[PDB]
Point group: C3
Chain length 149, copies 3
């Protein structure tokens, strides 16, 4: 049993030019790239993505910081939703564990490089929001026998 | 005082071609390569290596997965038995700490890339099982004065 | 709001030729190099640096190990004093968390590669001890908008 999570490199990850390093961290565990698309996030789609924060005073500045290039991604693996969150580390980089993305690259929550789905429900919703179902690609990793039990 | 531990790259480490990266992690701490040998593990030697699991229901599958190329290694350093176990991380990669080998490279316990002795007694027994005494090399690291107190 | 910390690569970091790797770990978080100087540390400066240990039995040996080439550094960032200490890891490398400098590079406390200020007061004192005010360089990182909230 594998699952799929939605991961998104935020504009700071694009502008700091660490896209390849981020992708490599997930590839290193044998997670499969099931979907990938560069876009520019706009306020209308960001309001849907951040629907949980509608009306909160921090939302407008959050949307402004997220208005820019982003890399939309779907990765597949065992327990990948929870594992990707663990690899990202805490929202606040100063609290994130050493060896996580946020601790290794970042200083503050307002520029923390990457978004990842926090639950199966959020992964389904976020994948649907940012990708058409057709953009999710089906193929098998050739090294599967040495990654999976 | 230094000690020696037995570390073995499992067939998944060979096949995923991460042998050099694994070795580099141990060299990075100034641990000394005291022995190294590529072999193909066979059931008879694996039964001895995993003697603690004799009769357990999971053993036949464990031996099958380990039947393949392995890199046998002995590393020397301060507290290296326990330290190497700490660097490997938990047997389940999903539980292993970020920055450990298992967390950085793997998904499931059945393909967790590397074995390391769990005690002084296991290290002595395992080194003797996989190496002859003539294969253990004694030399001094040139940077010893900057590694050891 | 940023602050500045004093970080010093000890003679073992110089001799093991890992200066660049150490610097890269701090640059990776968008910390700014505010000052940098290679020197050979003298007992006179080291006695003041380690003034908190005056009269203790271990101080003479501590000074002797530090009498050699060192790289004096000042880094600037959010919470950088505590964050740099977290990135360095525990004094004893065997107790340091995976992914910290000491855990990744070192074996024993007497050769633990790097010093960092432990508080706001000690950072201010140490920066002033090792650098003249004219050696502290004020400039803004071009990627500031993508690093800071």
């Amino acid at each position: 049993h594998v699952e799929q999570t939605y991961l998104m490199i935020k504009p700071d990850g694009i502008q700091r030019q660490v896209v390849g390093e981020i992708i490599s961290r997930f590839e290193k565990r044998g997670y499969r790239i099931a979907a990938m698309k560069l876009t520019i996030a706009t306020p209308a789609i960001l309001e849907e993505h951040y629907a949980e924060h509608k009306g909160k005073p921090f939302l407008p500045g959050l949307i402004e910081k997220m208005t820019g290039p982003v890399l939309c991604m779907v990765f597949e693996g065992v327990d990948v939703i929870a594992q990707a969150r663990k690899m990202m580390g805490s929202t606040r980089p100063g609290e994130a564990a050493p060896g996580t993305i946020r601790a290794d690259f970042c200083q503050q929550a307002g520029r923390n490089l990457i978004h990842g789905s926090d639950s199966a429900e959020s992964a389904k919703r976020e994948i649907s929001l940012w990708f058409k179902p057709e953009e999710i690609q089906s193929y098998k990793l050739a090294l599967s026998d040495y990654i999976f039990e």
